[PDB]
Amino acid sequence: QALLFPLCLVLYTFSTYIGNMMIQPGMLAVVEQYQAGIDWVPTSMTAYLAGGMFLQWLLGPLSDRIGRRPVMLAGVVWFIVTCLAILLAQNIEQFTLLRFLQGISLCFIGAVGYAAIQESFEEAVCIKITALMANVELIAPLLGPLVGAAWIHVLPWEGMFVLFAALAAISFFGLQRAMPETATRIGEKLSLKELGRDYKLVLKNGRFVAGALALGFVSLPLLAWIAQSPIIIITGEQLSSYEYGLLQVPIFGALIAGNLLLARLTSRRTVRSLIIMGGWPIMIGLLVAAAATVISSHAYLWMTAGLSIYAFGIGLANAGLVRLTLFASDMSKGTVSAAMGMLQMLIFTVGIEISKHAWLNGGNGLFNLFNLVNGILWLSLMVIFLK
Numbered sequence: 001q002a003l004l005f006p007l008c009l010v011l012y013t014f015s016t017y018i019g020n021m022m023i024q025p026g027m028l029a030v031v032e033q034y035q036a037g038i039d040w041v042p043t044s045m046t047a048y049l050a051g052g053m054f055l056q057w058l059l060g061p062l063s064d065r066i067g068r069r070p071v072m073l074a075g076v077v078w079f080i081v082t083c084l085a086i087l088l089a090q091n092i093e094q095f096t097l098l099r100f101l102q103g104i105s106l107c108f109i110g111a112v113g114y115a116a117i118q119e120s121f122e123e124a125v126c127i128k129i130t131a132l133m134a135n136v137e138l139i140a141p142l143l144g145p146l147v148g149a150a151w152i153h154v155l156p157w158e159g160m161f162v163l164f165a166a167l168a169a170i171s172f173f174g175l176q177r178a179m180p181e182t183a184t185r186i187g188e189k190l191s192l193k194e195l196g197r198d199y200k201l202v203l204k205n206g207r208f209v210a211g212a213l214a215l216g217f218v219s220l221p222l223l224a225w226i227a228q229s230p231i232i233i234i235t236g237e238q239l240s241s242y243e244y245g246l247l248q249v250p251i252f253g254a255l256i257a258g259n260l261l262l263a264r265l266t267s268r269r270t271v272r273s274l275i276i277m278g279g280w281p282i283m284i285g286l287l288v289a290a291a292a293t294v295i296s297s298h299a300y301l302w303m304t305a306g307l308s309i310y311a312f313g314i315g316l317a318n319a320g321l322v323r324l325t326l327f328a329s330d331m332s333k334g335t336v337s338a339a340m341g342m343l344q345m346l347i348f349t350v351g352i353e354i355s356k357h358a359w360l361n362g363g364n365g366l367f368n369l370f371n372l373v374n375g376i377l378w379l380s381l382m383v384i385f386l387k
């Protein structure tokens with residue numbers, strides 16, 4: 001009678017994702033309007049992502065105790081408020097803090113929204129819902145930059161946050177009528193001390209931590225590209241929004257192509273073999289982008305080629321490493337998931353800032369060299385992690 005639930009959670013998820021991806025290309029208009037330096041462009045995403053790791057560890061056990069409905073709806077509202085509130089920001093510092101506060105809305109998708117999905121639907125229907133969510137996450141970083149660039153060509157950046165709030169508002173009402181209460185520990189006491197002990201315990205698991213760290217390092221080059229390609233292409237290479245948008249296609253296309261191959265190969269390949277398989281394009285790609293731009297600072301097409309090859313590798317290898325990492329720890333999936341979520345966003349957050357300084361100080365060469373060491377760190381962890 002009511003499938004409005006998973007569909008509205010999907011719409012919310014989509015909106016928090018363009019909440020990131022549509023904004024990055026817009027950030028050039030943003031810093032122009034505040035008369036802030038281009039160094040604040042990538043920090044927009046850093047702050048957004050830092051918000052995404054802020055309440056991770058807490059929302060799951062909390063929504064288990066007080067209800068999935070109140071917590072989930074609260075997150076959607078928080079998203080609406082913080083999106084609107086950024087229109088009143090008076091300087092880039094204030095703009096960035098709000099990016100952070102908006103980012104907290106991310107924590108609600110996995111820890112409480114998705115947990116409600118698992119506690120509602122048949123193990124078969126739940127698979128198709130998760131498939132749709134994965135498609136959304138795969139399409140957002142492709143569509144976002146393109147839509148974002150075409151948006152600021154005709155409309156003010158403030159408009160984008162109105163769009164995000166509107167979409168999430170639609171999504172609020174759909175969840176208000178169709179989301180069931182599935183929390184199993186309603187009324188039970190939540191102990192922050194026991195929660196801390198849970199997390200101290202998961203982190204002592206060496207094999208788990210290596211896999212979690214590896215996921216962060218390996219995805220970092222992709223996130224660093226999202227954060228910085230606007231300043232790399234437009235302000236750096238003196239190119240237009242058209243080239244910026246176009247260079248996105250081979251990169252996230254290859255990501256998609258990588259996940260598609262993974263779909264076809266999975267019945268005749270173990271997770272272990274697909275990771276080793278992905279390792280070749282992951283490494284070759286990063287190597288190519290680094291060598292080329294060391295050789296020639298402005299070889300941005302070689303750079304895009306390298307990153308496409310790398311992105312294909314990620315498509316093939318990551319989901320399998322996610323699975324192994326999840327099952328490398330025997331503790332509650334809520335706890336294990338939030339732990340691996342926080343570990344990798346720690347790497348993204350710090351990594352984008354280091355990346356930004358690499359590019360500001362040494363240009364494309366440094367940008368790509370830093371990406372290469374991240375791949376090497378993944379590779380290093382995989383030699384130990386695989387057995």
Ligand SMILES: O=C(N[C@H](CO)[C@H](O)c1ccc([N+](=O)[O-])cc1)C(Cl)Cl
Pocket residue numbers: 016017020049106137219222223314318344
């Ligand atoms: O980097 C990737 N994404 C993962 C999730 O699979 C990463 O943890 C992530 C999560 C959220 C996000 N966001 O909404 O801005 C970005 C990256 C790709 Cl490997 Cl799919």
Ligand SMILES: [Pr+3]
Pocket residue numbers: 194
């Ligand atoms: Pr306990």
Ligand SMILES: [Pr+3]
Pocket residue numbers: 194198
């Ligand atoms: Pr416990």
